[PDB]
Design a protein around this nucleic acid. Structure first.
Ligand SMILES: [Mg+2]
Ligand SMILES: [Mg+2]
Ligand SMILES: [Mg+2]
Ligand SMILES: [Mg+2]
Ligand SMILES: [Mg+2]
Ligand SMILES: [Mg+2]
Ligand SMILES: [Mg+2]
Ligand SMILES: [Mg+2]
Ligand SMILES: [Mg+2]
Ligand SMILES: [Mg+2]
Ligand SMILES: [Mg+2]
Ligand SMILES: [Mg+2]
Ligand SMILES: [Mg+2]
Ligand SMILES: [Mg+2]
Ligand SMILES: [Mg+2]
Ligand SMILES: [Mg+2]
Ligand SMILES: [Mg+2]
Ligand SMILES: [Mg+2]
Ligand SMILES: [Mg+2]
Ligand SMILES: [Mg+2]
Ligand SMILES: [Mg+2]
Ligand SMILES: [Mg+2]
Ligand SMILES: [Mg+2]
Ligand SMILES: [Mg+2]
Ligand SMILES: [Mg+2]
Ligand SMILES: [Mg+2]
Ligand SMILES: [Mg+2]
Ligand SMILES: [Mg+2]
Ligand SMILES: [Mg+2]
Ligand SMILES: [Mg+2]
Ligand SMILES: [Mg+2]
Ligand SMILES: [Mg+2]
Ligand SMILES: [Mg+2]
Ligand SMILES: [Mg+2]
Ligand SMILES: [Mg+2]
Ligand SMILES: [Mg+2]
Ligand SMILES: [Mg+2]
Ligand SMILES: [Mg+2]
Ligand SMILES: [Mg+2]
Ligand SMILES: [Mg+2]
Ligand SMILES: [Zn+2]
Lengths: 60, 126, 155, 82, 208, 99
RNA sequence: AUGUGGAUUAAUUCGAUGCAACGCGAAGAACCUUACCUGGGUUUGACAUGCACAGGACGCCGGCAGAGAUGUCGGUUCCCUUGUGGCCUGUGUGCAGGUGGUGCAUGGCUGUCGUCAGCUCGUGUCGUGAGAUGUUGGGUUAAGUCCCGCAACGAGCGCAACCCUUGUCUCAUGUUGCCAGCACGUUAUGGUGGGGACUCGUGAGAGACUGCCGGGGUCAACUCGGAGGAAGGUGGGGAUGACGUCAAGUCAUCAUGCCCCUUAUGUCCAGGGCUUCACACAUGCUACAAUGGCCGGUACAAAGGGCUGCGAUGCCGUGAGGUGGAGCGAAUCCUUUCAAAGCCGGUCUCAGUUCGGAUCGGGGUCUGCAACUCGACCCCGUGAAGUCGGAGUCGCUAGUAAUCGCAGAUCAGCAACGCU
């Protein structure tokens, strides 16, 4: 993600319609889950490292 | 007081036995009114038919969850178990007939990447 | 089937009459898995045949299956770069099952405008010996007795 | 189609330009950079130069095309066939 | 993909979360600040190996506990690095921030710091041969640890090719959930590019 | 008759059980009637993610977000009991809501 | 309806190209995302930092001109304290800045061979040497799982187990959940006082181990049958990819070595595009009519979502929806008493059809500053191809194949027939 674009997105837009996520660190505008605030690969890596208190693999 | 519970594919049922007449009370309505299916009535009457004590027990049923067939089978199991409880002397014939053996099959887990249950997406080598 | 003969399911019997042939027929004619629809249609057509013929539905069905059940079949085989057919005897159980299959197949593909009546009429025709099922059986027996020559292969 | 309650939408700058033009009675070709501007009866005798991305193409407006957007009459893609 | 990380695979049985706190409304802001501060600390401190970073949050108060190879440079005799870290956290607006230093017992009984050392030796001048030999010997010398496996991937020696070589000794039963595996991963720098080093350590078994 | 709904809501079974045990002991020592940690259905949140970017999406996996909630209806809310509940220090893994 | 090939366009941004890409990287392209094309500004710069010369301004809320950036003006102005810290307006200095290139340089992650059972090491012995034994033969198992003699003696990654769910029972347990047995309701149902006698939801323990018997077996593995039992010979489904191969995918996640731009290939905005088509391929729904279309009555489940969000009753609309707004951070209030198929009653007697609905016109609702290219929903007119299909080819062996539904991920509005 381009730093200039990230900074512009962080800035306050002149219209409310121009608000979008832009996953925080990697700046990926796509494949991001709202509550987490992180994209698919970010979630994968952080969960595998165990940095979030409560996510874990699935087997039911 | 005699109580019993039957479960099959998420079909929990309640039955209370009464030596009075052969009245069927399914949520306040008779068996013929509730689930009017000949296969149902047949399977529900199968245990009493096997034991040959017809028109001697009154049953009140409370049903929650499950489907029609599931509820019918659970009720059959419940009345069979209640009959055994009130008189275990029929154990060897009823177990040989298979009325006292529960049915240990239900909806199974289905895979991620598969449509449902055991389904498989179209698999073409092209 | 590599390990060996697989177990066979314990097919149930029909309580309405007392013959598992009715259960077999309804299972064969099952379309889109509508059991109640299939069984009600089968019972209605059986009653139609009964009122049309004036006889016992079970007896006439037994007559039809007896008349239409084959005893010899034909199997395909290719040897030495050439295709050939061989006749092989068939178990009566499989013969009855395939007879039911042909009954359904020829109860599917005729132009009587109403299949509920048409299946009954097809049953009457098969019982009387003018049916497409008996015609197919005639053709199958003719093929088998024509290819009798290649029976030496025995497979 | 735009809802009647909201009504037609006209850009403020182009509205000011056309108002000045029709008030001064001068009729000239105006460089139009707006594709979302709807047509108004006041545009009956005004010429607008719409931008298609390559060059401002003038268009003459009459009463016939009332109720249609400016970009409808300005092709955006060139298709010469095969 | 070849192998899933044993840490993630065995989270639910043996290893515990290294961060514990409850929130749902400000959960986004909280996770943002934690991941930020973690990245900033990682990029700020490189001289001294840091095994793990654990954060616990109780309402406004936040406590961070640090494990490092040696505290000499992690905390100064007068508190140089301590005061720099405090000032950093205050700039990040951690509200009430409390610092603690916890020292590991066995320096080379765990994956992270041995990985750091191997990366440093590979980067500076040391050959991967001697690097693996010394690392394996030092890890073995400790009685508690039983199995060690070290893998190095990337460009080795400046050759225009990728060499994937691994050396194994002792226990590596990743399929057995009961086993205890320690996982580490760090990247070694060099003039020609980047090299990744991965190490697995087995430490006994747990019943209960 | 007044009742206080002490809401226990955490992620880990061990943590929630320990917090419940501590609450029961505190209430028993202070001398108040508590029904106990009545089990409640556990909300299940399942999320699906792909293996890696740039296709290879046929194989997936799921992550759950375990949330265990317990009901604690305490009768006779003694001032001493409420004060003790305020002063009790619990781990960050457990958050208690008083309503 | 989506994705690609092939042709145009100034652009249709780039990558992936049989198995192992083609409802792909796009879990939501009108601005943004876009990096493509035209045009207008811009400069040590939209955004950080250290060195010298200029300083207390910077930072901000509004009027005017403009396609917009932006230019000019109206209102406030430092917190410390004499050294300056914070911040940045003009000159540069290094330098920022690049979705520009290089997955034939790489880190990490991922797909297939394949959930196949194979793959190794220590000592010894043999030959000179590249090497062989262990890993050979017989029996048995889903398995390098095991037994028997053999220059072999041992060990390792794998296989099974330990983890989740599902099949039963026992104990603990009663609210927002249920009612055995008692009272109040009297049409609204445990609704209300009461109660663990069972499910109900979440804690502990037991239960399958060839457990026992008969025959085959080298008296050994292993196998058939039989009794008890819920399960009989890994009960069922899962988490779980040994060394390696395909220079397999990913510098368009992120980081990373080298080359390239720096007054541009960086940067802000106005309109257009990624939805273009004389054709082709792949995946899905609708069907091609009676096992049915349509109309009226009518009974059966799961689980999850809900704060700047679900939305009750009531009123007006055919219906999109308009007013209103109880109950809710949620076993409580909404997602209808969660229904569809199912059962009963009536029409159609096989038609290019009362099946079937696309295309093209005339009227409205909803979210959005902005619905023509380019969204979705409601009403009407329109009535096209299509009668089981060519060689070829695909999935499926028990709750299995077929058929009919419900909720969620991205989301103000949807391309939602895709995915879970
Ligand atoms: Mg947006
Ligand atoms: Mg994103
Ligand atoms: Mg494919
Ligand atoms: Mg295993
Ligand atoms: Mg499609
Ligand atoms: Mg392309
Ligand atoms: Mg394809
Ligand atoms: Mg292709
Ligand atoms: Mg797909
Ligand atoms: Mg663009
Ligand atoms: Mg675009
Ligand atoms: Mg490139
Ligand atoms: Mg490439
Ligand atoms: Mg092979
Ligand atoms: Mg020698
Ligand atoms: Mg050999
Ligand atoms: Mg060999
Ligand atoms: Mg051997
Ligand atoms: Mg081998
Ligand atoms: Mg093995
Ligand atoms: Mg009760
Ligand atoms: Mg391999
Ligand atoms: Mg390669
Ligand atoms: Mg290559
Ligand atoms: Mg680069
Ligand atoms: Mg680089
Ligand atoms: Mg360059
Ligand atoms: Mg540039
Ligand atoms: Mg722009
Ligand atoms: Mg596109
Ligand atoms: Mg459909
Ligand atoms: Mg209305
Ligand atoms: Mg209803
Ligand atoms: Mg239509
Ligand atoms: Mg139509
Ligand atoms: Mg329709
Ligand atoms: Mg046609
Ligand atoms: Mg037709
Ligand atoms: Mg063919
Ligand atoms: Mg959306
Ligand atoms: Zn991300």
């Amino acid at each position: 993600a381009k730093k200039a674009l990230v900074h512009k997105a962080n800035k306050k837009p002149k219209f409310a319609v121009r608000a979008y996520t832009r996953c925080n660190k990697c700046g990926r505008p796509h494949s991001v889950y709202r509550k987490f605030g992180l994209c698919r690969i970010c979630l994968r890596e952080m969960a595998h490292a165990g940095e979030l208190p409560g996510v874990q693999k699935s087997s039911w | 007081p005699i109580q019993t519970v039957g479960r099959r594919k998420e079909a929990v049922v309640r039955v209370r036995l009464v030596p009075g007449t052969g009245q069927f009370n399914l949520d306040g309505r008779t068996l013929e009114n509730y689930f009017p299916n000949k296969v149902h009535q047949q399977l529900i009457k199968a245990p009493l038919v096997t034991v040959d004590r017809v028109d001697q027990f009154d049953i009140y049923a409370h049903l929650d969850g499950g489907g029609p067939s599931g509820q019918a089978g659970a009720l059959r199991l419940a009345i069979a178990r209640a009959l055994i409880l009130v008189q275990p002397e029929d154990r060897p014939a009823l177990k040989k007939a298979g009325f006292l053996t529960r049915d240990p099959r239900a909806i199974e887990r289905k895979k991620y990447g598969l449509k449902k249950a055991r389904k498989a997406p179209q698999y073409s080598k092209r | 089937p590599r390990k060996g003969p697989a177990p066979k399911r314990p097919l149930v019997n029909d309580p309405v009459y007392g013959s598992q042939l009715v259960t077999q027929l309804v299972n064969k004619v099952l379309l889109e898995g509508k059991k109640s629809l299939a069984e009600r249609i089968v019972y209605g057509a059986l009653e139609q045949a009964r009122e049309k013929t004036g006889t016992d539905p079970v007896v006439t069905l037994k007559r039809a299956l007896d008349n239409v059940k084959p005893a010899l079949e034909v199997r395909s085989r290719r040897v030495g770069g050439a295709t050939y057919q061989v006749p092989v005897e068939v178990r009566p159980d499989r013969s009855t099952t395939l007879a039911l299959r042909w009954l359904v197949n020829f109860s599917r593909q005729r132009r009587e405008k109403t299949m509920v009546e048409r299946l009954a009429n097809e049953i009457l025709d098969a019982s009387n010996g003018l049916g497409a099922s008996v015609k197919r059986r005639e053709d199958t027996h003719k093929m088998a007795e024509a290819n009798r020559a290649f029976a030496h292969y025995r497979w | 189609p735009r809802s009647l309650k909201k009504g037609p939408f006209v850009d403020d700058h182009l509205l000011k330009k056309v108002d000045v033009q029709n008030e001064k009675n001068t009729k000239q070709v105006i460089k139009t950079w707006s594709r979302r501007s709807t047509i108004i009866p006041d545009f009956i005798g005004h010429t607008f130069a719409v931008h298609d991305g390559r060059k401002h193409v003038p268009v003459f407006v009459t009463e016939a095309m009332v109720g249609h957007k400016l970009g409808e009459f300005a092709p955006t893609r060139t298709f010469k066939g095969h | 993909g070849q192998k899933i990380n044993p840490h993630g695979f065995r989270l639910g049985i043996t290893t515990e979360w290294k961060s514990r706190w409850y929130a749902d409304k400000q959960y986004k802001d909280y996770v943002k600040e934690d991941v930020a501060i973690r990245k900033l600390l990682a990029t700020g401190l490189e001289r001294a190996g840091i095994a793990d970073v654990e954060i616990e949050r109780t309402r406004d108060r936040v406590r961070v506990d640090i494990h490092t190879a040696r505290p000499g440079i992690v905390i100064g005799r007068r508190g140089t690095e301590a005061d720099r870290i405090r000032a950093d956290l205050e700039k990040l607006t951690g509200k009430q921030v409390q610092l603690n230093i916890l020292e590991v017992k066995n320096p080379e009984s765990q994956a992270q710091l041995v990985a750091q050392g191997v990366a440093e030796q590979l980067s500076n001048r040391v050959a991967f041969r001697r690097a693996m030999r010394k690392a394996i010997q030092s890890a073995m010398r400790q009685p508690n640890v039983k199995g060690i496996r070290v893998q190095c991937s990337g460009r080795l020696g400046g050759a225009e090719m990728s060499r994937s070589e691994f050396y194994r000794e002792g226990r590596v039963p990743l399929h057995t959930l009961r086993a205890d595996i320690d996982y580490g991963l760090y990247e070694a720098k060099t003039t020609f590019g980047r090299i990744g080093v991965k190490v697995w350590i087995y430490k006994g078994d747990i019943v209960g | 008759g007044q009742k206080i709904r002490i809401r226990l809501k955490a992620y880990d079974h061990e943590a929630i059980d320990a917090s419940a045990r501590k609450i029961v002991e505190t209430v028993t020592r202070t001398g108040a009637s508590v029904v106990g940690p009545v089990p409640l259905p556990t909300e299940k949140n399942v999320y699906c993610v792909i293996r890696s970017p740039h296709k290879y999406k046929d194989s997936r996996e799921h992550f759950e977000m375990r949330t265990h909630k317990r009901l604690i209806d305490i009768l006779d809310p003694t001032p001493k009991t409420v004060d003790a509940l305020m002063r009790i220090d619990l781990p960050a893994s457990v958050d208690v809501n008083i309503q």
